[PDB]
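quick one, five chains, predict together pls
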Amino acid sequence: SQAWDVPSAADFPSGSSCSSVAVYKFDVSPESPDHYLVDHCIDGRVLFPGTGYLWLTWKTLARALSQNLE
Amino acid sequence: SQAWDVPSAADFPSGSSCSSVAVYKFDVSPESPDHYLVDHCIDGRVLFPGTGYLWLTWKTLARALSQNLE
Amino acid sequence: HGVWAPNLHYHTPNPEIPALQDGRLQVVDRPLPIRGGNVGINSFGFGGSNVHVILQPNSRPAPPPAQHAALPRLLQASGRTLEAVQTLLEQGLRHSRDLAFVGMLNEIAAVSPVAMPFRGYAVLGGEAGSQEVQQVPGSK
Amino acid sequence: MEEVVIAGMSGKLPESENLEEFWANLIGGVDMVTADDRRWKAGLYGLPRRMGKLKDLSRFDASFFGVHSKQANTMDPQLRMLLEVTYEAIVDGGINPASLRGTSTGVWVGVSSSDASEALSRDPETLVGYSMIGCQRAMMANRLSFFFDFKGPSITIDTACSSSLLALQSAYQAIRGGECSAAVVGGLNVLLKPNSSLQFMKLGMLSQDGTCRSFDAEGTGYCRAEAVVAVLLTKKSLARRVYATILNAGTNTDGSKEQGVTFPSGDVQEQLIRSLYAPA
Amino acid sequence: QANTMDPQLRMLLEVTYEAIVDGGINPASLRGTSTGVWVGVSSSDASEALSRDPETLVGYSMIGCQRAMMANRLSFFFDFKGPSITIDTACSSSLLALQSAYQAIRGGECSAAVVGGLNVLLKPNSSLQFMKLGMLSQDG
């Protein structure tokens, strides 16, 4: 009945070393850590937070820097 | 005597798709394919061609596009 | 070398297993001379896959011959460079009377100069002290 | 039916280039584990500052082993220094490797991690296809058989932390039983990808301390180190040197423990130790 | 802990149950044997997959991807206390596993074996290498 995580074609290194790009995959369903996001309900849709993009971008910068967010 | 490539830990990723970045390494010594460049001698230095950067950038774009320069 | 390697980082014995001073097991904190070896060895992979193996060391010393008495031997060897040869001959002369060792050295030395293009010899014993170290024409 | 003996040995270990260096350390009590930016960085992702690290990793004698220079920069450094330590081991015990050329002699390699192989397969258009003849696991044994001309069994086993010992078992048996007259038993493990370690810490089998407190009340976890090592097994009636003789060996496997798969079941390790002693 | 399981290992856990019961045995009648498990595996693509995102990717992936776990975790579930082993010889493997197994029964060691062959194609790089060696058929 239940179907599971099959590592995906694009999950594997397809360019090279790149300190400067990050893909974030957001899951909103009740199980995910990122369920908190469902509380940003504007006009009845669940918009990903204006603020949110800065948090990613920020995160993404410390990646490239080898340092943590703090 | 001779020392070899040990995939340095730096090599390995932090997650990426990266068709969008390209490093070009230019060698100008008389053996290299890129010796032609030594004829761009301005004021006595061998400046890499203003034009040159566009040629790289261009190249770099068709990479990301899976297509060739032509 | 006839002496167990001193284990490291052994200060205070685990309080969850006896034997650690309860007479049974003796962690090796010090370089102890071995008396009559008969050794076991464990290896357990985190996935639950174990293997033991029991070892019996060979006990046996060097006899008293009559050959190296006044008979100089020939030590030869081969390597990849002047160094690889210089070293072996160094190890030869330090043990000029160890016949097991030198015999073995000689057996190794036998390798085509296609692969080991560097050779050298030495006359152990005898007022020779005679040692050449050259390079070697390829081909047959 | 036949007597089996450890007749050759060599390897490179933490802060040790050759087994005589590795002796100095043992006797002199010198923690070969150190704090270096050698494999990766000073303490990345929280990983502990200490690891048992090989002195050099980038050395190799490429012609002697007959490998066009390019095809060597695509060789998993394990495989590189395996090709050497096993020659160093075969000759260690008074044999000329050539006297073996074409035997029914086998090769048994215990390998868990082939980090180098992912390293040289990421870049898609920038990748040379003969990396895999120099990285695929089997090549750890196969390519060792290929060079010495050992026509008997060529095999790499992965049982995690055990492996090399179960290789050295699997080998002993194959000699004992008629199959072979000599064996190359190898153990390989080189630390390259920090991720690996990070996983191991997220399981708490990793000592933040960065040490192996062998029997001391303060054991957190272990401290991963690398090593390429090889011994040469042989039937007595063929060994010019004998370090020891193998009396017995066997392996079993912790059943279904109720406390997870990582849990070392002593009630089962006992059993193994018995099978090999007292009555049998 | 299942979304971090190499799909091989997943459907191995099933095909080997499907196989033990295939031949009229109740898997349980084996629980606690001196029964072994021999897996021929070349590629564990899934393992790298869940080992790149160092904030994202969890620690118990390796209890579900490390190669040995292909056999170990199959022994773990059926309670097979005999040998647990994964071999890599490339294209052969599974057949040399089924050999290595046969011998171990033949010789007294065991009374039964699980012999497995695993290979799942996930990373396109792999194939690309194989083509750059010309052992791949463009034909397909």
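The CA atoms of residues 62 and 69 of chain A lie 6 Å apart.
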